[PDB]
Design a protein around this ligand. Structure first.
Ligand SMILES: *C(=O)CCCCCCCCCCC
Ligand SMILES: *C(=O)CCCCCCCCCCC
Ligand SMILES: [N+]
Ligand SMILES: [N+]
Lengths: 406, 406
């Protein structure tokens, strides 16, 4: 079939507003977690989050941004970055049936959905709601709000799968190219950050609550004292392109997507079975004749999740386990945007030959012994990398990226 | 080059709780629209909707339904029907890596999102929210809540694209089979019905408001006096299966999916360009050398939308325009669930050899002159049918289904 590569990337995360700032953070093992007065004031127990430190005011045309929620905004900015980074101009990607977009979010826009209901219940009713809430709150917001202004004519929809959302978007973009339907597909996603959505995770005891006094230490994947993930927001976009098309235009190729796994646990609603992850990674590794040098785990810093994934990793690789680090210990978990942002962190590590450190591991978990968990920025010539993304509903996604021969 | 067929269906709509009840409604041109005190009490101008006339209490295991919102419930029930209709036993589709599920909703669950925020702001805070709001409100709720209890091991995620959602879910399912990755994929979707979501549409003037005293006449696609669509809820699911696999087990085949189109307008955020729909239908018709005997239009009864689609149809078929009817005039528009429900209506028409009437046309719009809009139930031996689905963000989907030879 057709080979697929990544020729551009864009990102807005808790550790950087572009790939340069992100690279700097990854290398330094810098945390993007800060104290949130908003979460505290809402009555939550978790008072920390991975927020985007950027004033998006006036960065998007007024007539365009009026239909957008934060998830769409973060993704839109990420896409602008990706387009430039890919060296693409309007004449090449706009009004072109061979160019599409697949990007989504985990929950659309809880903030505007609540805004809509709150306004409607007010004395002005419909007049207070306004005519822009639907595009801001609908689940497809991220794809709709980008495909329209960027004049995309190809495929256009969002894939949603909880914390695996943007990982499946990328995988599906790869499939569109392998099917020969598209030459280029912008893939990724975004997720807003707000108490409206965060309080639901706190309500199920999934968020960290014992480290509010020391925010940068809250997310501590694999640490024996971890107590839940740190919610984060942001966006990310990658330019997925057919190999010949990319070579023909002299594009800059970060890596080739040589593996994509998507499976289902068919077990628990909010807990991983591990069995699904094993099949997902094996699927992504099928046909890959090179060993996995680095593995960017899902590792959101949860008691069960963290170790369940490691057990799955041991089952897949056995004794030949790759180097592992959970970037979430620095950035927090951006839910729907986690898949693309982590794929990007992995691509930056591959591009710059280094392994980001898995921070805040003061006491390694016993069930994490016998594995190579990197806790310090390590320079190394990586060739093949793997990134895992798991979401509620037993949904699993795995991406394997490899450098292209010279 | 795998061929794909539909071997089972399930549905919960405003016009029936199973395929038999729906068949009867379609043949009788019976409206599923009723007056809604809920919408009126909320302060809306639109007081009509296509509600599901069924008490779902106790129809799903307590431990399972606790994680579900209405969209998931409708889809779940639809899937139970589809499984039985397809004649699939547990050991045939469960714990099987070759069996997946792709289903979504247009907006997850506005009701539970608002519920969570409301509860959180109350005197009980987190305790009032409970630990089940995330799985109910997340955009992937429909796929997550079904893949888990049905023991799905293959693909598992939701495709979301506003009012084209379930149509893209079906198309993606076809793609998974064509890629040889799955032998069976349950595809479809669901959408809850509530003022929390409906008021947002009324706020942009998209819903009918001039026929509240005569509910069954509110949805009137192609009528010169149409004034917006009638919001509806419900679910639908179809069993997408590889041909050889279906034949081998002696499955009942409704039709083969011979065409699937998915395009983007790249124009207006909440209005169709028409140009995108032309490309979508043409894409779905590629290689289809049989004429379209019946076209189930998106036709949601909107001023601009109704005629824009007819213009696109004229451009695609020219002087060879097919018989057309908008089932939405009877059922209302179920948003994310519309795609699969309309594909099911089309399959029932194909299976039973008849064309459902496009009701409530008291005065045909002038821009619809010269077309074959069926306004009376008409028996006819159909062979190839087409169904269109369009959504905000300029997202387009078209499905073409054809009876298998003998
Ligand atoms: C990751 O799998 C955990 C679940 C994330 C679901 C997406 C975010 C849902 C927000 C709306 C519900 C609060
Ligand atoms: C169809 O294209 C019109 C848009 C449908 C969106 C359905 C989901 C909306 C959820 C958010 C409402 C404020
Ligand atoms: N990851
Ligand atoms: N349709």
């Amino acid at each position: 079939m057709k080979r697929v590569v990544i020729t551009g990337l864009g990102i807005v995360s808790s550790i950087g507003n572009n790939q340069q700032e992100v690279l700097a953070s990854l290398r330094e093992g810098r945390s993007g977690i800060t104290f949130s007065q908003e979460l505290k004031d809402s009555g939550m127990r978790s008072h920390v989050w991975g927020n985007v430190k950027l004033d998006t005011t006036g960065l998007i045309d007024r007539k365009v941004v009026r239909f957008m929620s934060d998830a769409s905004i973060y993704a839109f900015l990420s896409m602008e970055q990706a387009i430039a980074d890919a060296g693409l101009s309007p004449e090449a990607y706009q009004n072109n049936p061979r160019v599409g977009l697949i990007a989504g979010s985990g929950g659309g826009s809880p903030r505007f959905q609540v805004f809509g209901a709150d306004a409607m219940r007010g004395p002005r009713g419909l007049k207070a709601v306004g005519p822009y809430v639907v595009t801001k709150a609908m689940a497809s917001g991220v794809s709709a709000c980008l495909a329209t202004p960027f004049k995309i004519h190809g495929v256009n929809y969002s894939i949603s799968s909880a914390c695996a959302t943007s990982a499946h978007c990328i995988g599906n973009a790869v499939e569109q190219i392998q099917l020969g339907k598209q030459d280029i597909v912008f893939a990724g996603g975004g997720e807003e950050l707000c108490w409206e959505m965060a309080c639901e995770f706190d309500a199920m005891g999934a968020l960290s609550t014992k480290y509010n006094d020391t925010p940068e230490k809250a997310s501590r994947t694999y640490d024996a004292h971890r107590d839940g993930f740190v919610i984060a927001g942001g966006g990310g976009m990658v330019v997925v392109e057919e190999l010949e098309h990319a070579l023909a235009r002299g594009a800059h190729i970060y890596a080739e997507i040589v593996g994509y796994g998507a499976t289902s646990d068919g077990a628990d609603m909010v807990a991983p079975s591990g069995e699904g992850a094993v099949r997902c990674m094996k699927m992504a590794m099928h046909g890959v004749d090179t060993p996995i040098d680095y593995l960017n785990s899902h590792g959101t810093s949860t008691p069960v999740g963290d170790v369940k994934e490691l057990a799955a990793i041991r089952e897949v690789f056995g004794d030949k386990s790759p180097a592992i680090s959970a970037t979430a210990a620095m950035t927090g978990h951006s839910l729907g945007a986690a898949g693309v942002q982590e794929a990007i962190y992995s691509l930056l590590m591959l591009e710059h030959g280094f392994i980001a450190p898995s921070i805040n591991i003061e006491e390694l978990d016993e069930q994490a012994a016998g594995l190579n968990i990197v806790t310090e920025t390590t320079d190394r010539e990586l060739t093949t990398v793997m990134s895992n993304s798991f979401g509620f509903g037993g949904t699993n996604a795995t991406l394997v990226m490899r450098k292209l021969k010279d």
